[PDB]
Design a protein around this ligand. Sequence first.
Ligand SMILES: [Zn+2]
Length: 432
Amino acid sequence: PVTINNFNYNDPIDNNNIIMMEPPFARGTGRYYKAFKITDRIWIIPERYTFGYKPEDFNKSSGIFNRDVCEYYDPDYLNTNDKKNIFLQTMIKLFNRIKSKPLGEKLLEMIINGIPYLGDRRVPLEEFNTNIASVTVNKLISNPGEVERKKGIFANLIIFGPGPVLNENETIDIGIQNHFASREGFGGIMQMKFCPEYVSVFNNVQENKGASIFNRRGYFSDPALILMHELIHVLHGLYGIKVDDLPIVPFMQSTDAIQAEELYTFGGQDPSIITPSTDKSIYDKVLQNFRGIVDRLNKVLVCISDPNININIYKNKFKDKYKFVEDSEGKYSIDVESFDKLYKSLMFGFTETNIAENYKIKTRASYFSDSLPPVKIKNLLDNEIYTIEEGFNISDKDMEKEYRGQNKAINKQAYEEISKEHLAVYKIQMCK
Ligand SMILES: [Zn+2]
């Protein structure tokens, strides 16, 4: 069972749930940020994602005429201790919403149990190595005003605040010399840029299909589903199955090329436009990568960075993670049936579509959908607007039927239009 911890931003450092941790991309460079353990292996650093970005990238465009309504900027987001607390409490509420039903509970469990392999492709077949950015992150164990002393701890996911564009949530993996452990069967510490308030809007759905122009319905997204979408990428990245650069050329609304990774993650009727050949090659690549992991497990003898780590305990943890089988002599191998079940679970089981169906959340029909302007949700921490159990679609307020709590024309008090330009663009899109 998954426990979702509680803390406030101003709560003191305890070297358990609240620490100073050095993120993966900042490894070796003694910069530590206040990190909060929301569940085992999952941390939240309520700061803006600045990796590979300059401070000027965070600024808004020079004026209204050159603004892009599809891309929202605000350099003042997360600038105070109180804004960093609002972020943490919103994340705890969203995580509590994810575990409120069986599907999301298992998603969090699969993420937690999906520990990165103790190594990558550079590591010898006979060794486990924890001294890399994709397996461990440094924790500051010394008090302020003392010479910095560290300890490497295991982690699976680190969620940060947004990068320059607030409404563009993204899950990132670690690359070493254009090779990602998260795409090679190993798995690796995943990172995310997340923003709960600025959500996506759509009008693609099963309705509107032939319906009158005035009777066209436009809805806003639930921040929990948006988070669950990104957590599926984390899952693929933790099990070493993230599909690398593979664009797919095409109900549906857009004909534009999209990544294979994004299609499987969205799910529903999306994996159907993928040629049976491409679909089979993605499956075969995962098998070949898992075959590499099993060969390593059969050859691993020592842990180079941690000669204390018990080889048998970790081999067993990896046997459970990848659902490998063992013979009478201890030798591991792949069982096609258990592999098929795990594969179908990671790629087709945990999708945005059936998470949306199970949670009564409204989402778009296809990923091949038009980008509508984002909207800002004023307060997610108010139960009169948003709940852990039901979302925006609250039963008492008659928002549970026809997903009316997500309908922009109906639940006008749950959100606010970012600008007059955003509304003007939305009105043209709703009535083409
Ligand atoms: Zn995505």
